[PDB]
């Protein structure tokens, strides 16, 4: 995330329930980054057990998990796969995930945007018999919201003028079959 | 001018600047509308372009 | 403060660390020097001759 | 870091469910504590150095 | 404002000069908010003191002030940092690597990225524009300040 | 130190890196102001670190350096630490003079 | 080993059977600290030596 190394983990804590005396699972999720000295920072917690129930509880397995960075966007992506069956493929599937900011704030993901994520990152991560690896999520092509860098300068002809760093405020796509148009506002 | 895939394309500052700045040595800035740029070409080399 | 908007935080770490992956060269560099901020109101830019 | 850590996973719950947490309340004080004598060790052997 | 407190206007910004003192007659330049969303000058505008006056679209972004609130940081690590190691380095006659560390602040042509030299001898900006970085600074006597 | 490899130079730096980035990412979640009105006195703020428990700093910006429509930066305090083992929930921290 | 045994030891429910176990929760940060603590000692000891 931002060039920077980060790590989510779950983990889980006995809880009995109170006139029934039963054990019971509450969940929570852990983030770490690593610092410039290269000492791991404060793991940072968010509780995600409600995320968790919704999937089919099916006693004593692990949520499948997604992590990633999108390109384009300030936030990183996390998910939970439900329990993933033996074969692939599928989707429509309910994920509930939630959206990491830089700032440690955190909002949680709508199902109609978890679709989205789901559909363009599946067969990313699967169920027993096989293990699986998470690539950057990106949907299309990956391309700069804004580039301001001169890349290379010329100057002029008698060195009495030339072109300062002016930037490309704005760059947006559209993604078509084999077809691609890019748009520029320089 | 823009490269990509195998056709130049041009964009002239009179037809894409809606306002033009008064003449100054100090500095002078265009603001370009919008431009649009073709699509496949450009030919990818190992994903990367 | 009545009309006055007066930053008071800076993202510029968060953005470092994307420059920090390479050597502490581009770390000390100018690319670096020049990193943005956020608007911190409705935003309204203009330019003055 | 880590006596920090030690400090906010001693402030959640120990005990459940019936009766609470019995979580020590001053574990962030006795973190600081710690993080205050290491401090000073630090320093003595920065200077021994 | 979220809320304009004028329809026809939403901020006027006059020029005053020493000679002349003036305002409210419509005469320096008004913005309104255009919706969803840009903001343009609205006639009448009188203007006539500005050479121009260009509305900035597109832009929402600033480059970090070192005059700024959280200045000293900014200095401490893109300056002080570079000197103090470099000197550091002298006193102990690293004199290869104490050529870099003050190259990270001043170098006579060691400056070349992406394969041509460039413009500036410092790296470090705020020498190169001069920043007032600390004002009224014979408050106390201080050679830095 | 007598000894100076690049290496033990660069990790100095790193280490110098890594104290600032903690002061650089703050949030300021409040503030006080030590005057009556406005216009004068000095205000002062409250920030948090992002670790387990919070960490608070502290800064201060006096108003009369606000001469021309903008901050003067003399007027800016370097953030002070805070010893005191604090834990306020959610935001419900405040200083006061 | 004798900080980490006894972290997982300290890790598992303490308390029972009506009420749940209590397990201290930061006891791997906290033993992570002690084994911070004795490494700089064991440094200066061989450094010294």
Same mark, same amino acid.
């Not at chain 1, 991560?125 to 860098?149: C, G, H, K, L, Q």
């Not at chain 4, 996973?9 to 004598?37: C, H, K, Q």
């Not at chain 5, 003036?22 to 008004?30: E, I, L």
């Given at each position: ?139 299309d092509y990956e391309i700069p919201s804004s580039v301001s860098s ?37 | ?49 | ?49 | ?30 973190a600081t504590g710690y993080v205050m004598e290491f401090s000073a ?9 | ?39 343009? !000058?609205?006639?009448?505008? @009188? ?5 121009? =006056?260009?509305? &900035?679209?597109?832009?929402? $972004? ?49 400056? !070349?990225?992406?394969?041509? @030299? ?5 790296? =470090?900006?705020? &020498?190169?524009?001069?920043? $007032? ?13 | ?97």
């Amino acid at each position: 995330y931002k060039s920077r190394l980060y790590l989510l983990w779950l983990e889980q804590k006995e809880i009995t329930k109170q006139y029934q005396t039963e054990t019971d699972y509450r969940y929570e999720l852990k983030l770490a980054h690593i610092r410039y000295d290269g000492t791991w920072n404060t793991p940072i917690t968010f509780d995600v057990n409600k995320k968790i129930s919704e999937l089919k509880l099916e006693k004593n397995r692990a949520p499948g998990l997604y992590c990633a960075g999108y390109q384009g966007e300030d936030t990183l992506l996390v998910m939970f796969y439900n329990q993933q069956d033996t074969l692939d493929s599928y989707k429509n599937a309910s994920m509930q995930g939630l959206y990491i900011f830089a700032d440690m704030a955190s909002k949680d993901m709508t199902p109609e945007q978890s679709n989205v994520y789901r559909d363009n990152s599946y067969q990313q991560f699967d169920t027993n018999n096989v293990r699986r690896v998470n690539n950057r999520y990106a949907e299309d092509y990956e391309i700069p919201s804004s580039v301001s860098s001169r890349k290379d300068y010329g100057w002029g002809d008698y060195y009495l003028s030339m072109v300062y760093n002016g930037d490309i405020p704005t760059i947006n796509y559209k993604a078509a079959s084999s077809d691609l148009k890019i748009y520029i506002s320089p | 001018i823009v490269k990509a895939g195998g056709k130049e394309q041009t964009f002239t500052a009179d037809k894409d600047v809606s306002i033009q700045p008064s003449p100054s040595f100090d500095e002078m800035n265009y603001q370009f509308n919008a431009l649009e740029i073709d699509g496949s070409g450009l030919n990818f080399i190992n994903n990367s372009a | 403060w009545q009309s006055y908007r007066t930053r008071l935080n800076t993202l510029f770490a968060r953005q470092l660390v994307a420059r920090a992956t390479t050597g502490i060269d581009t770390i000390l560099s100018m690319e670096t020097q020049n990193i943005q901020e956020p608007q911190l109101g409705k935003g309204f830019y203009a330019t003055f001759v | 870091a880590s006596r920090l850590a030690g400090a906010a996973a001693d402030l959640v719950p120990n005990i459940f469910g019936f009766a609470g947490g019995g979580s020590r309340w001053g574990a962030i004080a006795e973190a600081t504590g710690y993080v205050m004598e290491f401090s000073a060790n630090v320093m003595n052997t920065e200077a021994d150095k | 404002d979220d809320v304009p407190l004028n329809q026809d206007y939403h901020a006027k910004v006059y020029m005053t000069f020493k000679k002349s003192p003036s305002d409210g007659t419509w005469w320096g330049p008004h913005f309104v908010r255009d919706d969803k969303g840009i903001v343009t !000058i609205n006639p009448k505008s @009188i203007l006539t003191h500005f050479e121009s =006056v260009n509305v &900035l679209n597109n832009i929402s $972004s600033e480059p970090m002030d070192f005059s700024g609130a959280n200045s000293l940081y900014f200095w401490e690590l893109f300056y002080y940092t570079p000197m103090l190691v470099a000197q550091r380095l002298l006193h102990e006659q690293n004199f290869d690597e104490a050529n870099r560390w003050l190259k990270y602040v001043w170098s006579p042509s060691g400056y !070349i990225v992406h394969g041509q @030299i460039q413009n500036y001898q410092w790296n =470090v900006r705020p &020498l190169l524009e001069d920043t $007032s970085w600390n004002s009224d600074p014979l408050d106390s006597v201080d050679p830095d300040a | 130190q007598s000894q100076l490899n690049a290496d033990t130079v660069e990790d100095a730096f790193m280490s110098y890196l890594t104290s600032f980035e903690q002061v650089a990412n703050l949030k300021v979640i409040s503030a006080y102001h030590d005057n009556i009105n406005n216009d004068q006195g000095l205000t002062y703020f409250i920030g948090l670190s992002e670790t387990d428990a919070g960490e608070y700093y502290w800064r201060s910006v006096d108003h009369s350096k606000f001469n021309d429509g903008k901050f003067a930066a003399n007027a800016w305090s370097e953030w002070h630490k805070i010893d005191c083992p604090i834990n306020p929930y959610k935001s419900t921290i405040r200083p006061v003079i």
